[PDB]
DNA sequence: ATTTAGTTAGATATCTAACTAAAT
DNA sequence: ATTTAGTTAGATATCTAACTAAAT
């Protein structure tokens, strides 16, 4: 089996399983992780470009994702007072409640995954993944 | 220190991007490349649209759209089976075959520059563990 | 004059639900 | 009456290119 096949499938399947679980929250996988990131780093408090950089997503992409979240009233955006170009992002109380609500799912997946592999194997695995991801700049 | 989902997502994304970049000169996408590849390797079996759906782990509509794209590209031909006309058969065109023969080198070159760093033992171990994980999610 | 942050437009990949055509 | 094999419709995610607006 080629590597591309492997990764593209374990990630297609991961995305699918995640969406299946998140169906009761009316958000997608990507929105779930974005919401989570915002949960972690809200206090910073980051612009859209920061999210783009942190997530490996282009500007228009995150613009659409964020406009989606904002339509679901899970986040809020305002213009920075110092740099009118910038758009500062924050979680609303609904967004925060939601993040506190699904987050168990992601952890469930991570656990159900690591339970397949012995800790030495899991550690060597993550190390080799990190190295591979490093290879592609 | 990194969630598995993060690593897999990111890796798949960078692979898809580099692939798309190198494939731009052929005016196809990563997915089209792999589809044409699968056609190349299993054309002989009379691949129905849904057999491709099963093999690529994509859904019927998805496959329909990608195939329709490739057909618009004239890289593939479509016809209706004689034994069962609710089903239609898929085939590589000569343009398509030449294309596959042309770009396969990219997927190989990438798979290569990826495998090389990891020692062949670590490589075997990794493809094995990866297979185990994908097995689990399936 | 350039550089940077965000939005728009056009175009693929992908999913589920609904639908048409046709084997059983 | 019931399944299968593709298509259509409507949706989200993503990227490139061209855009407006705003900072050097």
Description:
The structure is a homodimer. Chain A is mainly α and 137 residues long. Chain A has one domain (1-137): Orthogonal Bundle (Arc Repressor Mutant, subunit A). Helix content of chain A is 67%, strand content 7%. The first copy, chain A, contains seven helices and two strands; from the N terminus they run H-H-H-H-E-E-H-H-H. Chain A has helices at 3-22, 29-41, 48-55, 59-71, 93-102, 104-114, 119-135, and strands spanning 75-79, 87-91. In chain A, strands 1-2 form a two-stranded antiparallel sheet. In chain A, strand 1 (75-79) and strand 2 (87-91) form a beta hairpin. Chain A starts with a helix and ends with a helix. In chain A, 23% of the residues are buried. Chain A binds a DNA duplex (24 and 24 nucleotides) through helix 1, helix 2, helix 3 and helix 4.
């Amino acid at each position: 089996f080629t590597y591309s096949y492997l990764f593209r499938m374990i990630s297609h399947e991961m995305k699918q399983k995640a969406d299946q679980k998140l169906e009761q929250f009316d958000i997608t996988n990507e929105q779930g992780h974005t919401l989570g990131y915002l949960y972690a780093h809200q206090q910073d408090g980051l612009t859209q470009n920061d999210i783009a950089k942190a997530l490996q997503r282009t500007g228009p992409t995150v613009s659409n994702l964020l406009r989606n979240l904002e339509r679901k009233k899970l986040i809020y955006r305002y213009v920075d007072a110092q740099d009118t170009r910038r758009k500062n992002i924050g979680l609303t109380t609904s967004g925060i409640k939601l993040v506190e609500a699904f987050t168990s799912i992601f952890d469930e997946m991570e656990q159900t995954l690591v339970s397949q592999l012995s800790e030495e194997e899991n550690e060597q695995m993550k190390a080799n993944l990190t190295k591979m991801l490093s290879s592609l700049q």
